[PDB]
Amino acid sequence: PQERLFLQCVYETIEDAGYTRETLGKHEGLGGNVGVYVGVMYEEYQLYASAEQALGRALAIAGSPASIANRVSYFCNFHGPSMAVDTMCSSSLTGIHLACHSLQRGECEVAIAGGVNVSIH
Amino acid sequence: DIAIIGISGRYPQARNIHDFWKNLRDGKDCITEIPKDRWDHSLYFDEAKDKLGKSYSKWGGFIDGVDQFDPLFFHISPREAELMDPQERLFLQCVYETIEDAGYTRETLGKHEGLGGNVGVYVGVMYEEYQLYASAEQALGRALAIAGSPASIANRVSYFCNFHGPSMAVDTMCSSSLTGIHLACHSLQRGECEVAIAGGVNVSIHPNKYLYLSQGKFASSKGRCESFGEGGDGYVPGEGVGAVLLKPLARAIADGDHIYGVIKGSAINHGGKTNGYTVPNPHSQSRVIRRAFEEAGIHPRTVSYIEAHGTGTSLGDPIEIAGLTKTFQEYTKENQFCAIGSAKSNIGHGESAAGIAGLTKILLQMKYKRLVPSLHSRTLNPNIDFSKTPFVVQQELAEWKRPVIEIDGVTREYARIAGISSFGAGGANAHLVIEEYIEAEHRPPSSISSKNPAVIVLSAKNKDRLREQVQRLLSAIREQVLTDNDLAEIAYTLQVGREAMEERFAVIVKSISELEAKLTYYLKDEADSPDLFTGQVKRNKETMDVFAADEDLQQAIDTWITKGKYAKILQMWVQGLIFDWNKLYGDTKPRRISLPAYPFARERYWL
């Protein structure tokens, strides 16, 4: 669900910015050069799978928070860097800071920083 | 230009880089069945693709002794250690092994700040599966709470070693290692950090990992391991922990520290929208490589060896080959002038240390000057023809010859350039450009003599650890074949590059044979030895303390150094006395060398 809410949140933002997925830094000819950074502390959604496995049946939910940003890059067709940094209680600013420099170095024309956290276990 | 002044690692059937190298040049298909200490493994195997998550079961490279740690050395209670992620433990040890390998002390590593040193840390990890047992226990009853937060892998390090640099845990599937390195490279140039420690870590300790790898069709049937060609249809997950210390090239040469390689350039990007999820896009794979060589200002024709993402996947090799071919044809149309290989065919698939493992593989080849054979590439994929490609898969150990080429009417001998790729399942991509470092002019003129002899010193937290260090030192003097010239450097690294312990032992030497003999003296059980200065610090605390707490008394020790009374200093150093070893030689300190690191205990700790 962390993936779901963040993905919705990004799309709300792009519209909120007044830019369309097919025109937002689209000045590349193949999708635009947009970077993505997301800060997440941990995923507790696979723990239900382990609990189920201990009780029986068979279920395998994977973590790999890098999905949180890649899916965003996948759906929106961005060709910039995409990562999931993690510093305790300071991921969101770390993600911003990295994006700040990448724009300075010219790697990305536009950036999308943020954070996400939900309590479900 | 980022130099690497250090490296270390643990990999399946390898406790060291040397051990890893021997298996590499021995071409050992170092992948085996799951050990019994882990999950029972007989519950889920069904040799069929039906809902059991296994049937790709007894194939994985594993590192011996995953649950072994030495917490007292790190001021950690046994209760606390028992519930700290083994991943955190293993990375913590390697970094200290890395620091020790570089010949730097935690109190002198970029310590040119006055309060601990400005050292940045970046660690790449995909997932932590050690809290899961807590979930099972809670489900079964009782009460147990292990937290994750893979930042603890990096924060604990910055905590123990007193570092004042940024510390983060980046995460990109199967590509954290190169993403972690890439970020570290840019921070150094901007000046936020002076010295950095990138890396990766991954250990497979819960069957759920194997379950998901089958439910998704990412496994490799019953195949032994990755096959770069000839009908490979999956990958075999494996364990691995590694680290690498980075420093700007000008500084490292100034400090004289030994240089393994040079990271000229790097780049990262993401494919975007493709014909489905987890489908690599060659066009991105072209661009990221292309930008990488541009940032480095390296011409692809000058390349010699490239490590490919491999993975032996059916729909990953031809895509990887086309992209590499595409970005290379832009500048040269020649064929079969670069070799291509992968380490995963030896150690399985890390998914987070694959980048460092691939990075480690290159450096050893660059150190020993010998391209290593690949494995499982006897036949090659029939789909793709390598005659047109500029890449031929390595099949046998060979000397890694220096490039000489004529480009634009000009024949030149360039250095040994290599590149590496790491393509993650999510779609993130990364690549690096490395080059060997050539020494312009530097040589130790064997100053060692009776006038100015060598002063070898070791130290360990007890005698058991001390005796082992002697043994490992002797073997390293043998296996690596050091000479009289190395003595000054051997002493030098052992003087500053090792942190003073409680149990201590020292000798005065002139020759290699002399050092070999005396160490063999200690190993045999004798309470008295000639000119072998033994001692401790547990006893003498106040008397040794008051020595340094005086200027007049300090003058006396400086006088001893002037007079060459090396016997007395060691006679007092073994008791606790501390003094600057730079005082011995006021200029032109010798080069450092890789010597075996502190032999950490094997105490066990599990839930």
Side-chain angles (χ1 to χ4, degrees), chain B residues 293-544:
Chain B
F293 286 98
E294 296 306 335
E295 174 156 319
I298 292 287
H299 188 290
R301 172 50 183 176
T302 54
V303 166
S304 302
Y305 175 93
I306 289 169
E307 189 171 324
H309 194 56
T311 68
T313 288
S314 56
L315 199 137
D317 282 344
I319 298 76
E320 181 162 0
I321 286 296
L324 281 166
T325 305
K326 177 182 180 182
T327 181
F328 264 54
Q329 285 190 1
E330 294 198 350
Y331 294 169
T332 177
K333 301 295 186 295
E334 312 187 21
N335 293 336
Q336 317 301 59
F337 77 92
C338 183
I340 189 175
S342 164
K344 294 178 184 61
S345 56
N346 296 278
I347 69 191
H349 188 60
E351 315 174 358
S352 292
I356 193 71
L359 178 60
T360 302
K361 171 172 170 174
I362 291 167
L363 296 169
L364 299 173
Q365 286 180 188
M366 209 168 62
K367 176 178 179 174
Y368 287 83
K369 302 178 173 61
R370 299 187 76 79
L371 304 170
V372 75
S374 174
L375 294 169
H376 305 279
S377 297
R378 326 306 183 196
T379 300
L380 314 183
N381 287 326
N383 311 332
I384 48 175
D385 57 348
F386 290 93
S387 307
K388 298 297 101 183
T389 73
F391 308 111
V392 55
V393 173
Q394 193 50 22
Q395 307 299 354
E396 59 189 348
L397 184 77
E399 303 176 17
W400 189 358
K401 190 183 164 64
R402 187 75 62 84
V404 67
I405 51 162
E406 178 286 294
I407 44 171
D408 295 320
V410 188
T411 296
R412 295 171 179 176
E413 212 190 21
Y414 308 97
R416 301 188 185 187
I417 299 89
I420 173 168
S421 301
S422 168
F423 302 138
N429 305 327
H431 182 90
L432 302 175
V433 184
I434 306 168
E435 176 169 10
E436 62 190 4
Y437 158 76
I438 306 297
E439 301 71 2
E441 182 174 6
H442 177 276
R443 270 300 192 88
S446 191
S447 178
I448 306 306
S449 58
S450 291
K451 304 161 176 173
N452 194 3
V455 191
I456 286 64
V457 304
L458 299 180
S459 53
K461 276 281 179 291
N462 57 77
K463 287 191 180 178
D464 298 330
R465 302 285 80 92
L466 176 50
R467 193 176 187 286
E468 290 166 347
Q469 288 190 147
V470 175
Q471 179 44 32
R472 296 162 80 250
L473 172 51
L474 239 181
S475 66
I477 293 175
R478 297 243 153 75
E479 181 57 22
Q480 302 184 8
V481 189
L482 310 185
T483 76
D484 292 14
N485 300 345
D486 308 321
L487 254 177
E489 295 178 3
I490 294 168
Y492 191 50
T493 299
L494 289 175
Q495 280 177 29
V496 303
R498 296 300 185 267
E499 192 188 349
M501 308 305 191
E502 295 62 354
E503 200 83 51
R504 306 188 181 187
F505 151 83
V507 301
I508 301 186
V509 171
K510 287 139 53 47
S511 63
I512 283 296
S513 52
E514 177 185 9
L515 181 57
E516 293 180 346
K518 293 190 171 184
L519 296 170
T520 319
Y521 200 123
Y522 181 100
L523 270 164
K524 203 159 68 67
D525 182 6
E526 304 179 51
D528 178 2
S529 296
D531 306 323
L532 265 67
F533 301 67
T534 57
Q536 306 188 21
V537 188
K538 292 85 169 294
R539 326 180 191 280
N540 314 28
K541 307 200 177 190
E542 59 283 7
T543 58
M544 184 272 294

Side-chain angles (χ1 to χ4, degrees), chain A residues 88, chain B residues 85 87-89 91-92 95 121 123-125 127-128 148-158 168-169 200-201:
Chain A
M88 302 170 180
Chain B
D85 167 357
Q87 305 164 343
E88 183 172 346
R89 300 178 244 163
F91 187 68
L92 177 53
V95 171
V121 176
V123 63
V125 63
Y127 43 84
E128 294 209 339
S149 185
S152 307
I153 296 166
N155 292 332
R156 177 73 65 174
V157 181
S158 282
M168 62 186 69
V201 59

Side-chain angles (χ1 to χ4, degrees), chain B residues 1-6 102 104 109 188 194-195 245-262 437 442 589-592:
Chain B
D1 296 345
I2 301 299
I4 293 163
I5 56 170
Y104 276 111
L109 180 50
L188 291 173
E194 220 256 318
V195 165
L245 188 72
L246 297 168
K247 172 179 279 188
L249 186 66
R251 296 290 302 164
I253 298 163
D255 297 9
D257 196 5
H258 76 290
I259 299 166
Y260 274 94
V262 177
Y437 158 76
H442 177 276
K589 284 78 178 182
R591 178 181 301 280
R592 303 179 155 74

Side-chain angles (χ1 to χ4, degrees), chain B residues 106-120 161-165 194-195:
Chain B
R106 300 185 287 90
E107 303 178 8
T108 185
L109 180 50
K111 174 260 288 183
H112 307 285
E113 188 177 344
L115 205 67
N118 213 345
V119 177
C161 298
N162 187 36
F163 292 174
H164 295 14
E194 220 256 318
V195 165

